[model samples]
Target: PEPKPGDLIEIFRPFYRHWAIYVGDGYVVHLAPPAIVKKELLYDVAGSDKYQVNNKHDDKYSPLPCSKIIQRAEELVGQEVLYKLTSENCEHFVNELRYGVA
Candidate 1:
């Protein structure tokens, strides 16, 4: 199936994983290495690494439809100062986008 807006995106690195929300038009919204919750081109988000639409949270949470999920994610484009690697990470953000609760 094609990746729809608000789908969960993941990029697995050597020891850790990266997560993002597909925002369509070849772009995604993610918390990048710089710790900024920003939107970027999908290529940039993947950064030469293989990535996939891995809805790891699907079983635990009922997500909003794609449109509303994308809207919720977009509304949070500039949230980052409160980001915490231990408790609040990219997965947390996408979970919030998908299910309206993180």
Candidate 2:
């Protein structure tokens, strides 16, 4: 099932950092790593141009969608949740999931 607007998403046991909630329309927002700013929402992870590599300040990268996470996100249909992610951390998270966390 695809994620819609107003949904709670939680990335449990994140391979690299922490967990987050999905707020529908291809968005997974989470918090972790002290360096990241609060209330950051990553939009369109599945879309093209997922992340910017040149920008070292922000965490931008592609994360592999896990079955468990997908299942949980599908459940939330009409709920609002907080979202967070750092520029650098976000990118790192995506890369870790894609190539295996080291």
Candidate 3:
């Protein structure tokens, strides 16, 4: 489905967090606080040479691909969401729901 302004994007399974915002083409922008920066930092450091790291903190806005992320933004309209997971709990969630979990 196509995303519009004021849509929500919820990352399921591996990343059980709900991000609320608008979608633009292949990218989606949302309101994320400290957690976003922390997550991005970890990915940047852990990603291999082929996985380039783009710091979202620089612009106070993070742009993620609709394909890379789970669930379309249109599904989460007018809802309050939160993500409760850390680096340590990453594997637990992944192993439990690799296919995708709501």
**Using TM-score as the measure, what is the rank order of every candidate, best first?**
1, 3, 2
Which prediction has the highest lDDT against the true structure?
Answer: 1
Mark the 10 consecutive residues where model 3 has the least summed lDDT.
Answer: 37-46
Q: In candidate 1, which residue ranges exceed 4 Å CA deviation?
A: 86-88
Q: Candidate 1, residue 74: CA error in Å?
A: 1.1
**Residue range 19-98, candidate 1, lDDT tens digits:** 88898998788776566678888887778787789877679877888889888778877777465653247777788888
Tell me the lDDT of model 3 at 26. Answer: 45
CA deviation > 4 Å runs, candidate 2: 14-18, 34-102
State model 1's lDDT.
Answer: 0.77
Model 2 lDDT, residue 76, Cα: 38
Worst 10 residues of 1 by lDDT: 81-90
Instruction: Report the lDDT tens digits of candidate 3 across residue range 1-102.
Output: 544432343333233433323334444433334423122222222233222122223254343443433344334323333664453343223221222342
Which model, 1 or 2, shows the larger TM-score?
1
Model 3: how far residue 21 lies from native, Å: 1.7
Colliding pairs, model 1: none
